[PDB]
Symmetry: C3
Subunit: 249 residues, 3 copies
Amino acid sequence: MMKKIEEARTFISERTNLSPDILIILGGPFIEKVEDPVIIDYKDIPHFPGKLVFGRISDKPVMIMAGRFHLYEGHDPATVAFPVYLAKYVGVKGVVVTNAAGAINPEFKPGEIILVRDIINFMFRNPLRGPNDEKIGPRFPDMSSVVDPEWARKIQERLSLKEGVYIGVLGPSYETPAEIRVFEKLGADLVGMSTVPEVIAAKHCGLKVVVFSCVTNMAAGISHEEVVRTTKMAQGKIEKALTTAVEVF
Amino acid sequence: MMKKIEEARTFISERTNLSPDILIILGFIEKVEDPVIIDYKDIPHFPGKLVFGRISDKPVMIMAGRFHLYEGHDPATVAFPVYLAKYVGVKGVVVTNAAGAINPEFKPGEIILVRDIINFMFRNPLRGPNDEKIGPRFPDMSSVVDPEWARKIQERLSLKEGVYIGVLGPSYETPAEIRVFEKLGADLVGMSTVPEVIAAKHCGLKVVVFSCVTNMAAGITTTKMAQGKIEKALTTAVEVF
Amino acid sequence: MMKKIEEARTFISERTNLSPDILIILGSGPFIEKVEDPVIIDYKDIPHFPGKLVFGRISDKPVMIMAGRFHLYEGHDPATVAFPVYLAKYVGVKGVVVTNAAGAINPEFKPGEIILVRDIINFMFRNPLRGPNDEKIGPRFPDMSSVVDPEWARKIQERLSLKEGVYIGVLGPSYETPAEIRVFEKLGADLVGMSTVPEVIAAKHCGLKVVVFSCVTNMAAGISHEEVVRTTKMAQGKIEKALTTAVEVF
Ligand SMILES: Nc1nc2[nH]cnc2c(=O)[nH]1
Ligand SMILES: Nc1nc2[nH]cnc2c(=O)[nH]1
Ligand SMILES: Nc1nc2[nH]cnc2c(=O)[nH]1
Ligand SMILES: [Mg+2]
């Protein structure tokens, strides 16, 4: 594991000397804004399971995952997490995880960006299962404060986004109204199929975390023109969220 | 996957030219007209017996025996027979199950029309790469149970309805676990149904589900003697499809 | 499976003729130090094991102790976590005392306390029985209506009067979020830990009586080194007495 990380790191190092401070995990508007972009295809990167883009956003050096991994694709949880460990050793200090989510909270609207304040793991998989390298992180990571209080406060002082709890589920089929009523009872505001594994990895290796959700739809039980409109709304709202997060870090 | 389906389909086609409209999944068979039986042990890529024939003049494909994740099967393996049914030509699936009644109004021996499902198995037969020719990457599960099929069934039978929660098993639940499931809104608990329903929705089949209550669930306080009620439910479902 | 059991059993037999009545499953003190005529067998030497077994007597009663246990977060198959319990059955035990470390969800529980677990919720979504079943070992579909032996628990409680709670088993290894813990509280859990469920399912399967004790190590998420040392000592001595009582009243 540590050998795989080193191998991938060396590969990257030979293509960019950037010392990025922030990893950004995305599923145009924002990527197109990156300054002096260096692109590295996932297909060329040792031990990867898409493209990494390195460069600067508001003068700050960043590493962007243009494309991410999901347990519904068949990936082992550790594979999903590996790019995050790679980021740590390339030198990042924080991770912005974005996701697409169904709104369980009826006050949320499709197209909105929600600051995720906490997570629930309903995937019942964990990238840490198996023997642990204490050089990478502890056996039993504290998940008492997943979202960095200061980072979120500085972001919120600028953007004043809605906040919500995110529940991660395996997918790939969507949820039933019965399932969604369960999640509502259990306190979730948003449901998606990503985020949890990479957030667990990030906390493990000691990175700071913020998470944004883009509401793609109201969850089950709760026009193409409308998907067009909401897709446009989210793109520009997420660009501002992401830029703010980079700038205040 | 599509190759395994085609191989199984050719096998079946060489034994029955029936174009069945409905797949019936059973753990009534004696009533089937002109029955053609095919052992699961002979069918390419199967994990029991298929019975083809007619019920109230309508052609059907029956799974006399089904698969459960508690047996050790991969979810995709549990789902395969359903994809095979699709390509043999069925349009609907009637899934039966045995269930424990969490709703204390239900009594052992009753047939309940299942109105929705909760997946508490945390397994999905779709995990892994998806063939878009079979069905979409992200199936809609907003209306699993076909509203019209269920309405026509209910107009005849007026069954109780309930929410079915699928669990792995094979050990039964503790009273603490059953109180969880009650809080979460489940009326019935069983160890089947969910994987084959997910597969059906994926490949675009209509679905109805019936549960036979075999017992009150843990903490609250037979499929053979219920065979008559289930026979009527099944026959109604076929007839109104 | 039955062949693996017999192989391990023969290995043990050749080192101890004890006919132990009770298996005690511990995480790793004064309790082990108290065992009489202790015979120690390393897990590394035991056929088909995934720590040390210690055989001997506690208040004159012969016992088999697992000094060290297994967790699904380590990467073990559920059936592997369960195997020592089957082995215990065939060595002759009739009862199991499962200990664990747990986070207190119930705000009336304090770190360092021992709680008598009255029932379990499996939120690991793994089961050691998945796959084909040997009916000589136990039934295909074990009843879990009364996991904790009513009489054993009653005789323990008559002596100790411990708090009781519902234990939820989860995979880990990362700890829970405050959101996750509010889920568990709503679902009726008093304690959360990462062990117990697989071995208890196994035990019920093969027909052993079961009692479970939790040692509160901390309040769960969202609910001092000196205080760690204070509660650690408190727990040790409290668990010794719980364990000794359980053996004595069996
Ligand atoms: N699980 C789930 N994931 C999503 N990703 C985007 N929308 C949704 C949804 O409604 N449910
Ligand atoms: N899980 C579960 N499955 C069942 N199948 C039939 N009865 C029951 C029950 O009580 N619980
Ligand atoms: N899952 C879980 N396990 C534990 N083991 C000891 N303390 C804890 C806790 O707070 N949560
Ligand atoms: Mg060995």
